[PDB]
């Protein structure tokens, strides 16, 4: 009964890439906004818009390189049945460093290489590939 | 059922009226049904198989039969 | 209801009793009591005419109104009483003017129920009507066999009689044994079914229970000697004869109704 | 099935006003009143298993609402359990 909304955001993204949709809407959240911001930095989406007042929604404009989708695959890692925490030297490398591992560490949400350069580990959220 | 023969009528036409009326009323079919008891599994399977066979005839006739053969 | 006893003794082990809470706990109405001397099954020549009768708890006779002559006058059920002389329970009934009478209790009948006899009363269970104004199909009890005679059929606990047909002067009833019998339609009947219908379920547990119900032990004819019974005799359990009454009349199948003067009122034989 | 004037009598006995029909106290009192009426119903008929499933749904729902009210506010909870006559 909606135990993970972050995984729901990732599932909406993945079904939007597979179904060739342009923009994906969802209910919004602060962690969803931070994750979508990290995707917008690394270039897996190209925009994200929040609108509502007490009932906010979030629209991600998906990215397509000429035929296919930019996100080859996305996966959820620290699901609420198994929360995965990694130290700063055990931080994961996705696709040998061509995909980002979004980690919410003690200063905020960032990527894997941002955590390795900033020098601190945290909670992994997803593998974006 | 009851077939009143009108005056000055041929007998075979009144017999044809009777046979048509018993064919519409469904007499021999309902009597042929009630000779042997069928289990309700057999009745529901006969109903389901009749419906699937009817719609497999119709889905064949409506689009898989409209093309030319030769 | 039906209460089974706990096996704290063998005679207490096999007992099922009928506990009735609505029976009035007290002494009976002494204006309606007579004394009841026992017999032992012995007639005025003092000889045993009905065997296996004798002993038992002393019991006083309660005058049960069977006739229901007080017509067109209402009557309120006062209480339910235990009758020892009977299978059913009796109901003390107070008429509007002051007279109290015992009646047979119907099935649905508790204290406060207004009952009424007559030819006009109602069709509630408890009212007494002649079987001219009782509908065909209704369940009656305390049926008369002659007009004004008093009421003989359907009088044990849980028993009743169905009015099957009406034809002219006569009413064809179906008795509790399945026999269809004719009565005159001016015979009265009380509507409903006799109560205490859970009477048949008590299983009495011990020999002393049947001994204080007044019943005395049955010796089988095979156990006796050839002088005493036709069955008697043998070196170690021989029977070899057709089963008979102790006076040598065939039992176990043989019919013995020989009236010829009430055969006209019989529609079907018992079956 | 708890007709309208009886529900109005309970709503304007437990509610913040007549337009308040959805508090925990109003809902528990309506469920309790219907439970008592159906307790009248299930004294007879004794084998209505489907209506008894409907009753058991509303009994478990009253238990869940009362457990919420117990965790939320013990003072209103204890006042309601002395008012309505349920032991726990």
């Amino acid at each position: 009964s909606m135990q993970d909304p972050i995984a729901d955001m990732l599932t909406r993204i993945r079904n939007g890439q597979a179904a060739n949709k342009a923009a994906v809407t969802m209910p919004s959240s602060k962690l969803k906004v931070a994750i979508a911001n990290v995707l917008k930095e690394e270039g897996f989406i190209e925009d994200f818009k929040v609108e509502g007042d007490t009932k906010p929604e979030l629209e991600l404009t998906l990215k397509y390189f000429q035929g296919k989708a930019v996100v080859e695959s996305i996966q959820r890692v620290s699901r609420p049945g198994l929360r995965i925490y990694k130290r700063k030297d055990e931080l994961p490398k996705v696709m040998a460093g061509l995909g980002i591992a979004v980690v919410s560490t003690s200063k905020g949400v960032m990527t894997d290489r941002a955590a390795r350069q900033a020098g601190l580990g945290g909670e992994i959220i997803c593998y974006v590939a | 059922p009851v077939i009143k023969v009108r005056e000055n009528e041929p007998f075979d036409v009144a017999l044809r009226r009777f046979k048509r009326s018993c064919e519409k009323a469904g007499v021999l079919a309902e009597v042929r049904r009630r000779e042997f008891y069928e289990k309700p599994t057999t009745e529901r399977k006969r109903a389901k198989a009749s419906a699937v066979k009817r719609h497999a005839k119709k889905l064949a006739r409506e689009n898989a039969r409209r093309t030319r053969l030769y | 209801a039906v209460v089974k006893c706990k096996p704290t003794s063998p005679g207490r082990r096999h007992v099922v009793k009928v506990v009735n809470p609505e029976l009035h706990k007290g002494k009976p109405f002494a204006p309606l009591l007579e004394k009841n001397s026992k017999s032992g099954g012995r007639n005025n020549n003092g000889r045993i005419t009905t065997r296996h009768i004798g002993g038992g708890h002393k019991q006083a006779y309660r005058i049960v109104d069977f006739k229901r002559n007080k017509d067109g006058i209402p009557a309120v059920v006062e209480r339910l009483e235990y009758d020892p002389n009977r299978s059913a329970n009796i109901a003390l009934v107070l008429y509007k003017d002051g007279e109290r009478r015992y009646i047979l209790a119907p099935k649905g009948l508790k204290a406060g129920d207004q009952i009424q006899s007559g030819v006009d009363a109602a069709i509630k269970p408890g009212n007494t009507l002649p079987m001219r104004n009782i509908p065909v199909g209704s369940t009656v009890h305390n049926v008369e066999m002659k007009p004004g005679k008093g009421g003989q059929l359907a009088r044990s606990a849980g028993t009743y009689v169905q009015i099957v047909a009406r034809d002219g002067a006569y009413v064809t009833l179906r008795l509790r044994s399945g026999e269809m019998r004719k009565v005159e339609a001016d015979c009265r009947a009380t509507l409903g079914e006799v109560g205490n219908a859970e009477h048949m379920l008590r299983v009495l547990g011990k020999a002393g229970a049947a001994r204080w119900r007044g019943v005395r032990p049955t010796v089988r004819g095979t156990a006796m000697n050839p002088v005493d019974h036709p069955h008697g005799g043998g070196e170690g359990r021989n029977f070899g004869k057709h089963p008979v009454t102790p006076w040598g009349v065939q039992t176990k199948g043989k019919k013995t109704r020989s009236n010829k003067r009430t055969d006209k009122f019989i529609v079907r034989r018992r079956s | 099935s708890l007709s309208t004037e009886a529900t109005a009598k309970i709503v304007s006995e437990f509610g913040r006003d007549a337009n308040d029909t959805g508090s925990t106290e109003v809902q528990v009192a309506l469920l309790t009143a219907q439970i008592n009426h159906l307790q009248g119903h299930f004294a007879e008929h004794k084998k209505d298993h489907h209506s008894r499933r409907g009753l058991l749904r509303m009994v478990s729902q009253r238990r869940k609402l009362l457990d919420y009210l117990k965790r939320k506010d013990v003072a209103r909870y204890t006042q309601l359990i002395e008012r309505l006559g349920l032991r726990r």
Partner: protein, 66 residues
Amino acid sequence: FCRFTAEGVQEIDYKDIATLKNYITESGKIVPSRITGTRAKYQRQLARAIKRARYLSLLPYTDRHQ
């Protein structure tokens, strides 16, 4: 086509046995909805009213019976 929508009735009444006599066959059977074209809920109301009018002897059950 359905005629109970075409008139626009809300409940088929059991009393007017002209309509119920129209919707039965000659033998007393209820005529199937696939040939009269009545919609579903009015066919259920039709069977209900035909059975109720059958009870009150306003319609025969079978044509044959003594």
